């Protein structure tokens, strides 16, 4: 379904769920993909408006993040998912990205799943 970046937000999202009720790592995963998705939307068209006369590794990788984030994460067809399978997708895509661009999830949660 088409859901925006920063324009979209649900006022309650952690007072109906806790840790181990929707998984424990969920806590900080839920505020990763907000700040992590929202960053690719800033160069999701700017790759030739910033020319080929300045181009950096970090933001480039953040274009490829987006394409796989909209394909795989947002859309999942009419195929059914559960909490645990919908969590899998998130981790996998973030695995391209280094540890140094992950900042909203703790090393504890990373020591569970990557």
């Amino acid at each position: 379904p088409p859901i925006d970046p920063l324009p979209s937000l649900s006022r309650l999202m952690n007072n109906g769920v806790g840790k181990g009720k929707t998984r424990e790592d969920h806590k900080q995963v839920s505020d990763q993909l907000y700040s992590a998705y929202a960053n690719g939307v800033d160069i999701r068209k700017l790759v030739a408006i910033i020319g080929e006369d300045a181009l950096t590794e970090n933001d480039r990788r953040y274009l490829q993040f987006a394409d796989a984030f909209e394909r795989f994460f947002i859309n999942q067809g009419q195929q059914n998912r559960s909490i645990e399978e919908s969590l899998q997708i998130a981790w996998a895509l973030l695995s391209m990205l280094p540890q140094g661009e992950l900042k909203r999830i703790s090393k504890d949660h990373i020591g569970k799943y990557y």
Partner: protein
């Protein structure tokens, strides 16, 4: 619209929850478009139940060829905004790729006249043909530019003129016309 606004009830309640919407402007239709459609502002609310029939009757790759034309036609809006911003002034190949492509799509393909039978009137093979003509040339431009072939030199080809002569051609002639032109595409592109 009665108020000039389309935020008014009677518009949304049965005239915009309809099966198709095409918006229009005043300076839109003045250039050479009659009846006009917008390039961006036109969406289709029911198409996902009309795909069977299109696949079988027309062409089996037809729901593929209309989504891939619209894709450019509407992503162009991405650039429209930055114009009215600071303005793009970074001429790059992958830049001017979208720009000029889409432009000709509005100049010759949205410019149709309901006054002639060579600017309009379409049957399966004509509607099929034209829509693949552009795609191909665009396709071949994508891998052209990638090596280092300037968009200037692509523009000053005779094949730009063929798309310019794909709105003054009859339906009857259309068959053999298209069969000759597919060779002029692959020749004047891959080779360079």
């Amino acid at each position: 619209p009665p108020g000039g606004d389309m935020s008014e009830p009677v518009t949304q309640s049965t005239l915009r929850i309809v099966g198709a919407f095409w918006r229009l402007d005043a300076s839109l239709a003045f250039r050479r478009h009659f009846p006009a459609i917008n390039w961006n502002g036109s969406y289709s609310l029911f198409t996902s139940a009309l795909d069977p029939w299109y696949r079988e009757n027309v062409a089996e790759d037809y729901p593929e060829l209309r989504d891939a034309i619209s894709e450019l036609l509407q992503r162009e809006a991405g650039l429209q905004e930055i114009v009215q911003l600071v303005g793009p002034d970074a001429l790059q190949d992958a830049e001017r790729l979208v720009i000029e492509v889409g432009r000709i799509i509005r100049e010759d393909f949205l410019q149709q006249n309901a006054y002639h039978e060579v600017d309009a009137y379409c049957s399966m093979k004509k509607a099929y043909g034209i829509m693949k003509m552009i795609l191909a040339f665009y396709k071949e431009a994508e891998a052209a530019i990638k090596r280092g072939v300037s968009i200037d030199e692509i523009l000053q080809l005779p094949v730009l003129e063929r798309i310019g002569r794909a709105r003054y051609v009859s339906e009857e002639e259309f068959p053999a016309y298209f069969e000759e032109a597919m060779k002029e595409i692959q020749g004047a592109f891959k080779a360079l």
